[PDB]
């Protein structure tokens, strides 16, 4: 006989696992979906079945009930409404003290811990709780557990993360942040950023200088100087990217309308003027 | 369902998915904020005959056996992303869904 | 575009797509009515360092180097179907689009 | 520097081909999309750029124009509207005498041969003409080119195919077609089918027998006998497939929930049923 990884919805056996096997050998393990066909045939019959006829016929599933089914950890075998064995997610929600909503690492709020654990089992193996309560915008009143502290991403979503605060302390690893502050290394910039709770941004490698235009700043490594007229400081930006589409128009800090944020960036790089999105959509 | 899962103390010779945790700190990558580690998994096992094959093309190469054609390899047939929080080139805090980080399924291609 | 193409007149060592014509009659497969032949192509070449890689998972496995990891294989990263006219098990004349018959692109996975 | 397979649409370099290269070395061939970055950096840097920053920055394409571009056969380099080199499909349509529509192997009608050759180049590399004129339904007045002959598939589409004519003689399974004819091999059944122009179908493995009911017929391989009262012959059918719709009228002049429901009723009763027309019988 032949041993197969599954029975498809057409009732046929699919994915050849082993040949020249008895049903007992094929079905000896606890794997739910393993299935068996009795007839020993040649390759080209097998090939014709798998590729041109929807799978092998007379497919006999090893497990018609939950007996001897091993769903593994966090799962349990249950007969469904059509009386077929299924490995469903059944995590242990027993010893969980918090019964309120939680914020998952995926930035989605779950009704409770048990729900997150069930989503962890079904679809997201990496899913964990980063903090209790709903996921929030801004770090205001986000009290992070343990040694973790709050930061926001590019869309102001709050995360509880563990900043690493042990940088190897050192040459010309100096960086000038957009805050006009000089940092000894990227690590320190990163940890200062992590501690501030929001992006500071790299203006240019080297010490910060009191530049009065982009003429005072030399950009290294294919970058161009862009001047921020709102704070009177410059930054070195790549300006290499192209704009592809179903673009969404934006309103920029120069109070002009662009086809897309990308179109805005190009006008910024061309003119040497730093432009940032004021709000989404065209300038009304 | 379409794939086979094994662990280290499995005696499965065929193409199979094994567990593997990748630790970003143990690589030293401070530019990754979260997660610090994750289950990446990997593929390992034999690919003989027509076993664990998804596409008919594999079988056809085996027959033709052209020059420089290696046998089928045990390789990912399904991949998943993970969500990551990290520093970009500008050292901005960026959240992003990163494709091709997790192996969901292994097969012979 | 995302893949590299080679012919017999290539001294290319990296993972690459080569031409390969499959003749169904020369296999004896009379149950295929049409086409009698088609260009299947195949993948062949080395997968060292980070070359010809699409997904980050590959690089992470190379670093971890777990037990039973053979390294990246040169494998199809994109497949195309072909249309076929053939006899099914009932010996009925069937037209069908058959997935995974043509390799469009090769890469290191 | 680094050599890359392409510049992405965001303008950055993707898919590392070679490292420690000059632009001249990287761009020495005729490959259209090959691109180069000047900076030599370590692995973890290349990785950060490729995976987390859209690809390698300062990506310089080897080919800014169509100059020295080798598109290969059937293609030619043309500058697009954004003045970027693209290999477009340009097959040779000059020495083609047929200027009417053609029927492709994909069973789709193309406006002309040249259109088919362009569809061949852009999306279906195996696409060929099976016969001149529009693709047709039924083999009526389908004159297939050369020695090729006409057959229809499951939805009555006409194809011009080369049947297999030289079957290898069997050392000797004989097959019994639904036509009540005994065939020396599957190859022979297929070739009778191909020449007939439509499916005959396998009744059962082995010699045809003059059965008077399904009791005379031994079905092999999990199959069950279904009796066809219209021709007085039996058939071995799998009756294994599951059915998940179509309402139909069966050859017993009864209404079924579906062809699927009809087949199951057929397998249950041991009586062959076929779709007479869609919809209720009343």
Numbering used by the authors:
A (entry chain D): 1 to 170, 173 to 246, 249 to 288
B (entry chain A), C (entry chain B): 1 to 109
D (entry chain C): 1 to 172, 175 to 246, 251 to 288
Question: Which text from the study accompanies this structure?
Answer:
Growth/differentiation factors 8 and 11 (GDF8/myostatin and GDF11/BMP11, respectively) are two closely related members of the activin/inhibin subclass that share ~90% sequence identity in their mature, C-terminal signaling domains and ~52% identity in their N-terminal prodomains. Similar to other TGFβ ligands, GDF8 and GDF11 are disulfide-linked dimers that are initially synthesized as precursors, which are cleaved by furin-like proteases to separate the N-terminal prodomain from the C-terminal mature domain. The ligand dimer elicits signal transduction by symmetrically binding two type II and two type I transmembrane serine/threonine kinase receptors. Similar to other ligands in the activin/inhibin subclass, GDF8 and GDF11 predominantly signal through the type II receptors, activin receptor kinase IIA (ActRIIA; ACVR2A) and ActRIIB (ACVR2B) and the type I receptors, activin-like receptor kinase 4 (ALK4; ACVR1B) and ALK5 (TβRI).
The complex of the GDF11 dimer bound to two molecules of FS288 was resolved using X-ray crystallography to 2.35 Å. This is the first structure of GDF11 bound to a known antagonist. Similar to previous ligand:follistatin structures, two molecules of FS288 bind symmetrically to wrap around the GDF11 dimer occluding both type II and type I receptor binding sites. As expected, follistatin domains 1 (D1) and D2 overlap with the type II binding epitope, whereas the follistatin N-terminal domain (ND) occupies the type I binding slot. The overall structure of GDF11:FS288 is highly similar to that of the GDF8:FS288 complex (Fig. 3a; overall root-mean-square deviation (RMSD) = 0.657 Å). Nonetheless, the structure of GDF11:FS288 reveals minor changes in the positioning of residues in the helix of ND. For example, F47 of FS288 is pushed inward to accommodate the larger side chain of M50 in GDF11 versus V50 in GDF8. This is consistent with other ligand:FS structures, showing that the ND helix is quite plastic in its “molding” to accommodate ligand differences at the type I interface. However, examination of the type I interface revealed two unique interactions in the wrist of GDF11 compared to GDF8. The second unique feature of GDF11 is the formation of an additional hydrogen bond between the backbone (Y49A) of the pre-helix loop and Q62A located on the C-terminal side of the wrist helix.
